[PDB]
């Protein structure tokens, strides 16, 4: 279960990183990258990830479907959003709210899909 494998992963993971009085985590679908039950991207039954698109522009969103739970291959669905900075930040918002899909992660997902746009604009 989620709380079980969190009580197993809280200290003896391989993504856990502990130096400089901080403790972050390098999980695939952990947004804010910090080691916590709430933001861990491997423990729960429904997670959310916001990665940068493989090319220059866009933001991919990785939801974890419910049906396939022990099948890692057909477990995650991915959607590339190569739109303006605002439509994508209303599409992630709809993807999360209107679906009622792990709704306490929404502002984290927006802040991350904004960090990506900002790290994909032309530098100065």
């Amino acid at each position: 279960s989620a709380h079980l494998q969190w009580m197993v992963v809280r200290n003896c993971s391989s993504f856990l990183i502990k130096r400089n009085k901080q403790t972050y985590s390098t999980e695939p679908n952990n947004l804010k990258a910090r080691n916590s039950f709430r933001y861990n991207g491997l423990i729960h039954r429904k997670t959310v990830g916001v990665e940068p698109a493989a090319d220059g522009k866009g933001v991919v969103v990785v939801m974890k479907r419910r049906s396939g739970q022990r099948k890692p291959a057909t477990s995650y669905v991915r959607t590339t959003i190569n739109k303006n900075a605002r439509a994508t930040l209303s599409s992630i918002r709809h993807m999360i709210r209107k679906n009622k899909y792990h709704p306490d992660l929404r502002m984290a997902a927006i802040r991350r899909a904004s960090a990506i746009l900002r790290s994909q604009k032309p530098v100065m």
Binding site: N84, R86, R111, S114
Partner: protein
Amino acid sequence: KGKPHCSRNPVLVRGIGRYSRSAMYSRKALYKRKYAALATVTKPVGGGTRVVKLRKMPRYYPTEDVPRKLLSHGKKPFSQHVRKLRASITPGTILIILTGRHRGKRVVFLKQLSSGLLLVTGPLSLNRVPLRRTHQKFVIATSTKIDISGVKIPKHLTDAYFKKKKLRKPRHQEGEIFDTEKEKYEITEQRKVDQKAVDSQILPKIKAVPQLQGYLRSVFALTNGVYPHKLVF
């Protein structure tokens, strides 16, 4: 649609009224005053009509935001603060400057501006101190006053009129090419006409007091054996 009325009880002391609660009720005659019981906008387009939304969602969200702060009640902006003034300073009083370029120069106090700075002007022809602002703390109020009540000080001599104006001459391409240093403060013909007009009314009164003009032309300075706490000025 009731006409506003001032407080019906004078303030004996700050925070305490002159009349009691029942007295206020009787004065207000409340015994006969019993009472009992946007974002979207349609706009045509070249098609159909579009429901344009005002103040759309921001296009950027910084990774972190500062949390809000608690609410205070007793803190107000400087513009709304109450400007104090020691009773030792009155219109026509002679003051001595201590910090400005007019160090130790005697001037004739004009009035107090809205901000709080004292608008003062010593005779320009005597001490060369025109209409200017000076803080009350940094000025010594000499115990020598002259009737200046009959002096129509122009109304446009506000704090904004006396506010500084950035030269805004760091550099430019035009200025780098045809450099003209960093400019100066060219005394406006308005500040000059105002200074002349004020002097035309102040000087006749000053000359009435014998030796007053010479005293103003003089400069206050400490000497051997003189201590500020031991002499009354």
